[PDB]
Design a protein around this ligand. Structure first.
Ligand code: 7TN
Lengths: 114, 114, 114
């Protein structure tokens, strides 16, 4: 799985250990080994949410499976929780787009997962 | 809805008020309240279009519905218009990818929109 | 088509001519004329892969068509190969998401491709 967070929160406000925390928590939540988890955080972004420049985030979670109604609610609670605790972003100022990727459409190590 | 612009135009060339303008114009065009519109501009990017580094943009519009043939033509005229007027990017050096998101695949406020 | 690479490799390690090489090699591989190819490279990123901050990349390739089982395998071999040679990224630390875009969902030059 791959999780990306784009935020206007400044780099200095991203705490040490945040990528490792996301890796671990996402491994746990998706039921996958951590070796499969990639995380990417992009601070200092020029963004607004509802026209306000208050802290906000625009994120994506891509996975081969483990995406669906209930699962996505559970990921959103987990992820908005981390963003609120660590980056002081209100959950109502977070959007997370979820993508169920087909194995044939994910490249890795010179091939795909198909 | 969420609109992202990645461009090689420099940060100083993004006018003050641009994120607000995009928010308002997209609220109008989508017919959704502005509280739901998120906008994200990423200048100073290492980019080419057609092998040239003249000003260009790579953009994305995600919406739960309000995506389709005619709508997307209208959005493209609107958004290329804004990018040409405000950032001086030629419409033929803009790509916009449109995504009709399922409500279950959009996380917000600890849950999803399903 | 549009190809994006996000990486923790520093900007100074991205060689001159990398965007042009990606453009040409993508045109070779997809068959699309080089005038239609857009490329975007984002270095200096805060990312991890498998919980490690060794060199890695998260990429995307969007195209109207020219996406599928065998094509995507071939793109991955190509693109991992370029990343390894030019940016010294191990192929097993690269993910590439492939998107077959509907023509109605790609804006350009004030309209869409539908
Ligand atoms: C890069 S692409 O993946 O978005 N595809 C294309 C990009 C293009 O850009 C410029 C064009 N004309 C003048 O410039 C095009 O006609 C054009 C066509 C593209 O492909 C198709 C293939 C079948 C149906 C619809 C579109």
């Amino acid at each position: 799985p791959m999780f990306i967070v784009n935020t206007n929160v400044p780099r200095a406000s991203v705490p040490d250990g945040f990528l490792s925390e996301l890796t671990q928590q996402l491994a746990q939540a998706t039921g996958k080994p951590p070796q499969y988890i990639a995380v990417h955080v992009v601070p200092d972004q020029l963004m607004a949410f509802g026209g306000s420049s208050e802290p906000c985030a625009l994120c994506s979670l891509h996975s081969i499976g483990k995406i669906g109604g209930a699962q996505n609610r559970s990921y959103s609670k987990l992820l908005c929780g981390l963003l609120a605790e660590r980056l002081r972003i209100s959950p109502d100022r977070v959007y997370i787009n979820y993508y169920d990727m087909n194995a044939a459409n994910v490249g890795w190590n010179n091939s795909t997962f198909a």
